[PDB]
Every structure is written in structure tokens, then in C-alpha cells.
Amino acid sequence: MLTQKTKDIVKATAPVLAEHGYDIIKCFYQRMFEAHPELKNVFNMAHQEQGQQQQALARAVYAYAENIEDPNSLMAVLKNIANKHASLGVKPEQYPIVGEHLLAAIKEVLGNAATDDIISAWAQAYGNLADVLMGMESELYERSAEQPGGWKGWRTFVIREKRPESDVITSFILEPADGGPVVNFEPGQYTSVAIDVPALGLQQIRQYSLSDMPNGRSYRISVKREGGGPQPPGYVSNLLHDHVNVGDQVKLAAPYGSFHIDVDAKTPIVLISGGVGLTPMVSMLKVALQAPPRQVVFVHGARNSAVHAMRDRLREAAKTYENLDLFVFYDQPLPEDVQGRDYDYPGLVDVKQIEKSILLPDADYYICGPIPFMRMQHDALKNLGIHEARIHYEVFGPDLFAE
Amino acid sequence: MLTQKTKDIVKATAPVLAEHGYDIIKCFYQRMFEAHPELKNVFNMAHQEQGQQQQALARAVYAYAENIEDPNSLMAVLKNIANKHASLGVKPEQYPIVGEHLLAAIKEVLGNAATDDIISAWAQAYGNLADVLMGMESELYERSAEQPGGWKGWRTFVIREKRPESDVITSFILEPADGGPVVNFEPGQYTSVAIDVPALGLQQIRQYSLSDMPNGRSYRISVKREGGGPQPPGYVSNLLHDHVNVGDQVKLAAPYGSFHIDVDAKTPIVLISGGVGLTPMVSMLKVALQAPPRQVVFVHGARNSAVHAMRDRLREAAKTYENLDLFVFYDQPLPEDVQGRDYDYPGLVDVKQIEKSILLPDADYYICGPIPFMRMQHDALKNLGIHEARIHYEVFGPDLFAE
Ligand SMILES: Cc1cc2nc3c(=O)[nH]c(=O)nc-3n(C[C@H](O)[C@H](O)[C@H](O)COP(=O)(O)OP(=O)(O)OC[C@H]3O[C@@H](n4cnc5c(N)ncnc54)[C@H](O)[C@@H]3O)c2cc1C
Ligand SMILES: Cc1cc2nc3c(=O)[nH]c(=O)nc-3n(C[C@H](O)[C@H](O)[C@H](O)COP(=O)(O)OP(=O)(O)OC[C@H]3O[C@@H](n4cnc5c(N)ncnc54)[C@H](O)[C@@H]3O)c2cc1C
Ligand code: HEM
Ligand code: HEM
Numbered sequence: 001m002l003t004q005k006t007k008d009i010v011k012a013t014a015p016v017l018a019e020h021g022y023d024i025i026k027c028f029y030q031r032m033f034e035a036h037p038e039l040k041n042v043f044n045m046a047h048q049e050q051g052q053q054q055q056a057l058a059r060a061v062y063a064y065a066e067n068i069e070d071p072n073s074l075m076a077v078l079k080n081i082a083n084k085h086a087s088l089g090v091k092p093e094q095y096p097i098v099g100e101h102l103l104a105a106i107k108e109v110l111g112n113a114a115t116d117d118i119i120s121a122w123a124q125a126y127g128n129l130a131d132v133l134m135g136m137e138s139e140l141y142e143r144s145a146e147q148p149g150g151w152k153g154w155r156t157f158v159i160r161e162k163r164p165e166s167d168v169i170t171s172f173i174l175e176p177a178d179g180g181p182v183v184n185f186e187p188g189q190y191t192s193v194a195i196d197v198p199a200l201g202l203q204q205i206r207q208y209s210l211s212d213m214p215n216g217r218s219y220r221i222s223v224k225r226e227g228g229g230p231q232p233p234g235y236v237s238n239l240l241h242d243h244v245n246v247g248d249q250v251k252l253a254a255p256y257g258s259f260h261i262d263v264d265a266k267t268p269i270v271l272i273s274g275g276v277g278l279t280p281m282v283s284m285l286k287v288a289l290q291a292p293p294r295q296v297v298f299v300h301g302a303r304n305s306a307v308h309a310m311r312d313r314l315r316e317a318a319k320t321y322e323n324l325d326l327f328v329f330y331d332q333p334l335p336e337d338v339q340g341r342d343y344d345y346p347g348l349v350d351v352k353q354i355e356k357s358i359l360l361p362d363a364d365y366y367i368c369g370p371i372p373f374m375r376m377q378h379d380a381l382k383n384l385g386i387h388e389a390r391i392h393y394e395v396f397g398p399d400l401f402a403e
Numbered sequence: 404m405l406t407q408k409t410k411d412i413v414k415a416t417a418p419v420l421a422e423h424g425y426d427i428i429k430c431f432y433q434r435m436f437e438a439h440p441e442l443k444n445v446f447n448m449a450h451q452e453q454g455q456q457q458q459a460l461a462r463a464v465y466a467y468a469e470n471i472e473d474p475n476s477l478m479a480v481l482k483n484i485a486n487k488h489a490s491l492g493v494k495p496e497q498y499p500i501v502g503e504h505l506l507a508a509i510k511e512v513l514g515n516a517a518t519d520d521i522i523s524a525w526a527q528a529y530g531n532l533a534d535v536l537m538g539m540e541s542e543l544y545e546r547s548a549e550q551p552g553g554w555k556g557w558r559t560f561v562i563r564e565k566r567p568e569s570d571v572i573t574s575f576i577l578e579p580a581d582g583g584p585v586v587n588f589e590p591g592q593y594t595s596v597a598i599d600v601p602a603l604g605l606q607q608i609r610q611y612s613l614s615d616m617p618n619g620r621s622y623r624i625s626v627k628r629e630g631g632g633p634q635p636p637g638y639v640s641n642l643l644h645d646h647v648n649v650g651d652q653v654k655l656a657a658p659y660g661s662f663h664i665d666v667d668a669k670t671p672i673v674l675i676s677g678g679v680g681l682t683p684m685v686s687m688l689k690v691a692l693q694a695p696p697r698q699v700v701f702v703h704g705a706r707n708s709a710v711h712a713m714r715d716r717l718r719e720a721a722k723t724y725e726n727l728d729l730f731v732f733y734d735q736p737l738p739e740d741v742q743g744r745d746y747d748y749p750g751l752v753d754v755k756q757i758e759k760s761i762l763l764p765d766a767d768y769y770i771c772g773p774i775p776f777m778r779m780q781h782d783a784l785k786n787l788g789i790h791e792a793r794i795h796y797e798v799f800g801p802d803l804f805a806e
């Protein structure tokens with residue numbers, strides 16, 4: 001447990017770590033992978049190139065520092081991390097590994113300025129956080145293992161169906177190879193797919209929102225095929241699209257995540273999604289429409305009808321349920337897309353154009369999409385007078401990028 | 404923080420670690436020193452061929468496991484370890500190093516039996532303990548640094564005086580090379596000498612009780628020359644006797660230890676020492692005899708007059724102070740030692756032979772000597788009806804050997 005002086009050295013040196021974040025990260029991964037190459041099967045090797053983990057580092061240290069005196073704030077962010085670590089299968093025996101190489105990297109990068117006081121302060125911070133996280137993770141693993149259909153580690157699933165939703169999104173319906181039950185989850189949570197990537201010669205692991213309601217038998221994910229454009233195609237999404245077919249197997253983690261509706265709440269929900277960001281929203285939509293009403297406004301932004309996932313099922317739902325309001329925004333509508341017919345508004349989701357429809361008293365707001373889209377929606381909701389406690393979000397990259 | 408299920412795996416598998424302690428200890432040091440040979444400057448390299456560490460490991464894992472549900476019992480022993488680690492200069496950044504190699508060793512020795520559940524439980528135990536220890540050690544370093552004449556790390560001292568006390572015990576009076584004040588200590592506390600051992604080509608560190616009262620200028624240690632007999636001579640004790648002379652320099656730690664008198668207490672103290680175990684007792688004697696009386700019974704066992712340290716000063720004190728009773732037992736008296744004249748009783752310290760003299764109401768008892776001697780005295784004091792809360796001891800090896 002940290003003394004005041006130790007917290008103060010952390011506060012004082014957080015900017016020093018942040019502005020050297022690039023070199024510390026590079027040195028950290030080089031050291032750590034030289035000593036433990038097997039860990040490349042757990043880390044993302046695509047992010048291993050790009051900015052950008054350096055952005056997240058800077059944000060972590062700065063958020064750690066500004067919150068080191070506020071254990072409640074600290075516990076909440078740690079929960080997001082523990083959930084993500086549990087999904088990846090992070091093990092207690094890995095904390096000393098990561099800790100040594102992280103400290104060796106800080107030491108190397110800071111050179112002469114890596115004084116005993118600084119290294120010692122951060123080494124203590126590291127051990128404090130590690131203890132909190134290992135215990136959270138352990139609790140998460142045990143709760144999953146003990147529930148009906150629950151497990152620890154990887155469980156083999158088989159693809160039962162694979163249904164294209166648009167030119168870029170495809171849904172995979174997944175049942176366990178063993179034919180047994182599958183643990184429940186809160187709508188909004190995710191699984192992780194761990195699969196071998198022959199281009200890399202390594203396993204990679206990626207999270208996917210559980211895009212259907214819980215049913216005890218199967219899970220559904222909806223995977224957007226990534227990239228080409230100007231930048232490299234993504235490893236796992238293309239691999240799932242092109243090489244994982246009906247009857248093939250993948251390994252899945254038990255559901256985790258702290259982004260989810262409270263299923264027991266009477267109160268309204270507003271679901272604001274950009275592109276593939278709709279995936280947790282659909283799960284939330286389908287559970288909420290179990291009356292208990294509850295009142296759902298589904299707000300979705302997509303480029304056009306060619307990329308809009310689950311177009312038909314969503315409008316059919318809005319014709320059938322009183323408590324659902326559907327608003328679709330097309331940013332670049334196709335010649336055959338017509339406003340007021342195939343979608344409601346042109347351009348990006350704009351909350352002012354549906355203000356009365358979304359300002360439901362007692363409402364919780366959920367937001368998922370690219371980070372610029374998320375910050376835009378976040379700011380707009382604040383401008384209406386909605387309290388931050390009522391705004392929730394899940395990132396399709398690192399959860400610390402728009403904090 | 405540990406879940407019930409994690410503590411349960413610890414409780415169930417302690418015996419497995421204890422049974423394999425020998426191999427785990429051998430593998431742990433091999434791995435650790437291969438990766439960080441510099442740590443050989445901090446560990447004792449007379450573990451050359453020593454099971455002393457396997458004994459202590461087996462006791463630690465069993466004591467830890469049996470107490471894991473009682474945090475108060477756990478905190479108290481962790482204080483003894485924190486004080487010893489602080490004396491050694493153990494650094495927060497070394498916790499991930501020890502943790503990794505310890506876990507790697509547990510994994511290699513247990514082989515097939517190192518299941519995920521077991522490795523995970525002990526890894527969490529390791530991190531939980533590491534956090535508590537680092538925080539205690541940091542608090543200890545800061546308190547020392549902030550006090551008049553205190554410091555962190557090594558401070559250079561010069562031997563001002565070197566006085567033989569018997570054929571085997573020599574005192575060293577030490578003042579700081581910088582000429583500044585030295586920090587106060589509680590009587591019974593120790594320093595650590597760190598010194599280069601050329602036979603080893605390494606620094607070695609040994610604790611020595613501070614054998615005089617605090618005075619703001621100097622420290623005194625009294626060092627028994629170890630070995631020859633049948634076993635190898637001790638490195639540091641022979642080195643100090645033969646090559647550290649007046650004017651030479653050694654490095655010392657600030658005082659630590661949880662074995663000491665309460666200087667502010669009115670109540671009586673009984674001081675039971677075997678051989679070199681008298682050294683903290685003398686400090687405690689000299690402070691207590693500052694009236695505030697307090698009432699001191701100094702009970703000492705030594706083989707004979709040739710080996711009895713500080714013989715003349717102790718009897719002279721007993722002639723001068725009303726509130727001091729002196730009892731000397733010689734186990735193997737020399738022809739020229741006469742009972743009733745040069746010592747009070749033949750044989751080992753036996754408390755029944757001075758029962759009325761030691762059964763002072765409200766008394767605290769302090770015991771220091773070889774472990775068999777300490778258990779003997781401990782048991783005897785219990786048989787008189789003294790509460791365990793009133794019996795204190797400090798070990799000249801590992802503090803967990805007679806718990
Ligand atoms: C909680 C959570 C839930 C998620 N839910 C979903 C979901 O429901 N549906 C879904 O499709 N995704 C979801 N994701 C995203 C998903 O996990 C993967 O990130 C996504 O499928 C891309 O994985 P990949 O292996 O295909 O791409 P990677 O190979 O890992 O590449 C990552 C991205 O970086 C780009 N890139 C790669 N290399 C470079 C480079 N050198 N320079 C610049 N750019 C580069 C790629 O084009 C790609 O867009 C979720 C993520 C999280 C954290
Ligand atoms: C809290 C504390 C306070 C202490 N206070 C004092 C004090 O006031 N005065 C004092 O003199 N000592 C004190 N000690 C003991 C002291 O710390 C040293 O342990 C002592 O001087 C021996 O160190 P050494 O380097 O000479 O022996 P080491 O070289 O460390 O060897 C340790 C012992 O093992 C034996 N040994 C070495 N090799 C072998 C072998 N391979 N096989 C079998 N046996 C072997 C040696 O003969 C020696 O006695 C204290 C210890 C503690 C923990
Ligand atoms: C106290 C120590 C640790 C801290 C503070 C920490 C913190 C973080 C943070 C802030 C994130 C980003 C969270 C997100 O995705 O939303 C993260 C992700 C991640 N962590 Fe840790 N962590 C620690 C230890 C570990 C350990 C021991 C491992 C085991 C290998 C680990 C492996 C990972 C991986 C694989 C990711 C996802 C990043 C990626 O996609 O490559 N972390 N952790
Ligand atoms: C959770 C982690 C740790 C635990 C539970 C632990 C526990 C202990 C215990 C029980 C002892 C015996 C104390 C004695 O001498 O009587 C000890 C001693 C010691 N520890 Fe640790 N310790 C830990 C970490 C560390 C670290 C990180 C270092 C850094 C080098 C370290 C270095 C030492 C040294 C040098 C000794 C003295 C033993 C010797 O003389 O060789 N320990 N520790």
C-alpha cells in the first residue's frame with residue numbers, strides 16, 4: 001500500500017512516462033518478447049505496429065495519476081481492465097513477467113534520470129495494481145466456472161451458421177463442440193475468439209460483442225471484415241470471413257465486459273451505434289423488448305444500405321413493437337436509398353434531429369462505434385443536460401482512448 | 404486480494420510445496436542468479452550447502468496456510484520480515500524478479516502436478532504478500548530517512564575502537580565517516596553490515612544487534628567469531644575479527660527489528676541470554692537502568708569465564724544498581740571458575756533456580772540465544788504461568804524457526 005510520498009512521486013512523474021511512452025512501449029515489448037516469446041499469442045501483433053498503444057499508455061499513466069487518491073474511481077476503471085484481462089485469459093503468474101520488463105524498459109528509456117525514487121515508486125504502483133487486478137480476475141474466473149454452462153480458459157465452439165448481414169458484416173452462430181449448455185451473459189458483454197493466424201505463425205485473440213440474446217445453447221457474433229482501404233487488412237476478421245466456415249471450430253472465452261444494460265431496470269434505454277458498433281445494441285434491444293416494455297430508442301448510423309447490418313430485421317421490429325423507436329442515419333446514401341423511405345436522416349447521427357424522441361426521463365444512453373463518432377455522441381448528449389452517470393460506452397479498440 | 408477458493412487451494416497445497424521445498428529452493432536460486440547474478444550480493448552465499456532455507460520455506464508455507472484466514476496474525480510476522488528486508492535494502496523493483504523465478508521453480512519442480520489452479524493461487528499469494536511487504540518497507544525507509552541522523556541505503560562508518568570481550572567476541576565501535584549524528588534506535592534492534600568478501604568475490608550482508616545504548620554519535624556491535632570446529636568458518640565474522648581494524652570502513656544499514664523494549668514503560672524487564680545472545684540485552688540493560696528504575700534481572704548463560712563477554716562490566720553494574728539482579732550460569736566452568744564467586748549456578752540457564760527473583764508482577768521477558776536455548780527458556784517461562792504476550796524473542800538466524 002502506497003505512502004503519500006510514493007503517490008506524490010507517481011503524480012510528479014506520470015508526464016515523464018507519458019512523453020517517453022513510445023520508447024518505453026517499444027522497449028517493453030522487445031524485452032518481454034525476447035524472454036517470453038509465447039506471450040505473442042496473447043498480445044495483438046497488429047497494434048504492435050501503429051502509433052498508438054503509446055496514446056493508451058499516456059492516457060493510463062495520466063488517468064492513474066490524477067486518480068491515485070480516489071480509490072473508488074480507481075476500482076471502477078480497474079474493473080474494465082479485469083474484464084478484458086479475463087477475456088484474454090491473463091494469469092496471475094504473468095504479472096511478475098510484465099512487471100519486470102515494464103520496469104526494465106522505464107529504466108532503459110529514462111537512462112540517467114531513472115532514479116531509485118522513481119523506479120521504486122512505479123514498482124510499488126505496479127505491485128499494488130497487480131494485486132487488485134489478480135483478485136478481480138480470479139473472482140471473475142470463478143464466477144464463470146461455477147455458473148451453469150460456464151468455464152475457465154478456452155472452450156471449443158463449432159460454427160453452426162454463417163450469415164452475411166451486409167457486404168462487410170457476417171454473423172456466426174456458435175455452439176460448443178461438447179454439446180453442453182453455455183453460460184448466460186448480460187446484453188452488451190463480449191466473448192473473445194482465439195484462433196491461429198498462419199500469416200503470423202501465432203494465435204491471435206479478438207473480442208466480439210455477443211450480438212444475440214442469451215439462450216443457454218448458442219452465441220452469435222457479428223464480425224465486420226476489416227481493411228484494405230489504405231491500410232493493411234485485419235488478421236482475424238478476414239480469417240473468420242474467408243476461412244472459418246460452417247462446421248469449423250474456434251476457441252471462445254466465457255462472456256466478460258462491464259458495458260451492459262441492467263436487465264432488472266424498468267427505466268428507458270437509448271442505443272446509439274455507428275457501423276459495426278450496433279452489435280451489443282442488438283442484444284440489448286432484444287432483451288429490453290421483453291415486456292417489461294422497457295422503452296428502447298435504437299439510433300443507428302451507417303454509410304448506406306449496402307453496409308447497414310440487419311436492416312430488414314430492425315425495421316420489422318419497429319413495426320411490431322410500440323416501445324421501440326428506430327432512427328437510421330445514412331452518411332453517404334446510395335442512388336437507390338431514399339430518405340423518409342429506406343432511412344430517416346442524411347449525414348451522421350445527430351441527436352438534435354430526434355431530441356424529443358431521445359430525452360426520455362430516467363434514460364440510460366449507450367454508445368458504441370468508432371472513437372470520433374463516440375466523442376461526437378458523448379458531447380451532444382452532455383449538451384442536452386444528461387448526467388455523465390447516465391452515459392455508457394464500449395470501445396472496439398482500447399477502452400482508454402476517449403475517457 | 405484472495406477469494407475463498409484461492410485460499411483453499413493454498414491451504415490444500417502448502418504440504419506439496421513444503422515437501423518439494425529442497426528442489427524448489429535449489430531451482431529458484433539457480434534461475435534467479437542466472438538472470439540476476441547481482442543479487443548474490445544481497446543473499447547469504449553460505450547457503451553453499453544449506454537446508455536451513457528448506458526448513459524455513461516448509462515452515463513459512465505451512466504457517467502462511469494455517470493463518471491465511473487471520474490477517475492480524477499474518478500482519479505481525481510480515482512486520483518481522485519487512486524489518487529484515489529493510490535492513491537488507493530490498494527494493495520494490497526486485498519483487499517481480501523474485502516472483503517470476505520462484506513461480507518458474509515451483510512450476511519446474513512440480514512438473515505435471517503444477518496445475519493452473521495451483522500456480523495461480525500461489526502467484527496471487529505471492530503478489531498479495533509482495534504488496535503488503537513493499538508498503539511496509541517503504542514506510543520503514545521513509546521513517547528512517549526523516550529522523551535526525553537517519554538515512555536510506557548504506558552509510559559509510561569507520562571503526563573507532565575494536566575491543567576483545569572474550570576469546571571469541573570482539574566489539575566494534577562505529578562512527579559515520581561523514582561525522583554527522585546517527586539515528587536513535589529501540590534497544591534490541593540491529594543494523595546490517597555490508598562488506599566485500601574477497602574469498603567470494605561478492606559483497607555479503609550480516610545483521611548485528613546494536614550492543615550499546617543510543618547516544619547520537621556511534622553504534623557498537625559485538626561479533627562472535629564463527630566456526631572452525633567441524634564446519635567451515637563463517638565469512639563475515641572472521642573477516643571482521645581479522646581484517647577490519649581501527650580506521651577501516653564498513654557500510655551499515657539504519658537500525659531495524661521488532662524485538663525491543665518499550666522505553667516508555669515503567670514495568671519490569673527480565674533479560675535471558677545465551678552466549679552472544681546478550682548483545683541486544685546490554686543495550687536494553689543500559690537504557691532501563693536510567694531511573695525510571697526500572698527493574699532489570701539480567702540472566703546470562705555462557706560456557707565459562709574465557710567466553711563470557713563483558714563479564715567485569717556486568718558484575719560492576721550489579722554492585723552499583725539496586726534495581727539490577729544479575730544471574731550468571733556457567734555450563735562448562737573452567738578449573739579457575741568457582742561457583743558462588745565467579746558465577747552463580749553451574750549448567751544451563753534454569754529459571755526455577757531463580758523463580759522468586761524473576762516472577763516480578765507485570766514483567767516482560769526477553770530471550771536471545773541459539774534456538775534450542777530459546778525454546779528451553781520459552782517453555783520454562785510458560786510453565787510458570789507467564790502469558791505468551793509477555794515473552795519476546797529475536798533469532799540470530801531466521802526469525803521463523805521456533806515460532
Ligand atoms: C470489447 C470489444 C468488442 C468488439 N466487438 C466487435 C464486434 O462485435 N464486431 C466486430 O467486427 N469487431 C468488434 N471488435 C473489434 C475486434 O475485436 C477486432 O479488433 C476486429 O475484428 C479487427 O481485428 P483484426 O484481427 O481483423 O484486425 P488487426 O489485424 O488486429 O488490425 C487492427 C486494425 O488496424 C488496422 N491496421 C493493421 N495494421 C496496421 C498498420 N500497420 N497501420 C495502420 N493500421 C493498421 C487494420 O486495418 C484494422 O482495422 C470489438 C473489440 C472490442 C475491444
Ligand atoms: C537479527 C540478528 C541479530 C544478530 N546479532 C548478532 C550479534 O549481535 N553478534 C553476533 O556475533 N552475531 C549476530 N547475528 C548473527 C550474524 O548475523 C552472522 O550470522 C554471524 O556473524 C555469522 O556470519 P558469518 O559470515 O561469519 O557466517 P556465514 O559465512 O554466513 O556462515 C554461517 C554459519 O554456517 C556455518 N557454515 C558455513 N559453511 C558451512 C557448510 N558448508 N556446512 C555447514 N556449516 C557451514 C559457519 O560456520 C557459520 O557459523 C545476528 C543475526 C541476526 C539475524
Ligand atoms: C498491474 C499490471 C497491469 C496493468 C495496470 C494492466 C493494464 C492494462 C490496460 C490499461 C489495458 C487496456 C485495457 C483495454 O483493452 O480496455 C490492458 C490490456 C491488455 N493487457 Fe494488461 N495490465 C497489467 C498486467 C497485464 C498482464 C499480467 C498481462 C498478461 C500477459 C496483460 C495483458 C494484456 C493484453 C494481452 C491486453 C489487450 C492489449 C492488446 O490488445 O494487446 N496485462 N492491460
Ligand atoms: C512476497 C515476497 C517475499 C516474501 C513473502 C519474503 C519472505 C521472506 C522471509 C520469510 C524471509 C526470512 C527472513 C529472515 O531472514 O528471518 C526473507 C528473507 C530475505 N528476503 Fe525475502 N521475501 C520476499 C521477497 C523478497 C525480495 C523481492 C527480495 C530481494 C532480493 C528478498 C530478499 C531477501 C533476502 C536477501 C532475505 C534474507 C535471507 C538471506 O539471508 O539470504 N525477498 N524473506
Ligand SMILES: CC(=O)N1CCN(c2ccc(OC[C@@H]3CO[C@@](Cn4ccnc4)(c4ccc(Cl)cc4Cl)O3)cc2)CC1
Nearest residue numbers: 025028047052053054056057060098102371396397398401
Ligand atoms: C482505436 C484503435 O484502433 N486502437 C485499437 C487498440 N490499440 C491498443 C491496443 C492495446 C493497448 O494497450 C494499452 C496499454 C499499452 O501498453 C500496455 C500493455 N499492457 C501491459 C499490461 N497489460 C497490457 C501498458 C499498460 C499499462 C502500463 Cl503501466 C504499461 C503498458 Cl506498456 O497497455 C492500447 C491500444 C490502439 C489503437
Ligand SMILES: CC(=O)N1CCN(c2ccc(OC[C@@H]3CO[C@@](Cn4ccnc4)(c4ccc(Cl)cc4Cl)O3)cc2)CC1
Nearest residue numbers: 428431447449450453455456457459460463501505800801
Ligand atoms: C547461518 C546460515 O548459514 N543460514 C542462516 C539462515 N539463512 C537463511 C536464509 C534464507 C532463509 O529463507 C527464508 C525463506 C525460505 O527461502 C526463502 C528465500 N527468499 C525469498 C524471498 N526472500 C528470501 C523464501 C521466502 C519466501 C518465499 Cl515466498 C519463497 C522463498 Cl524461496 O526465504 C532462511 C534462513 C541462511 C544461512
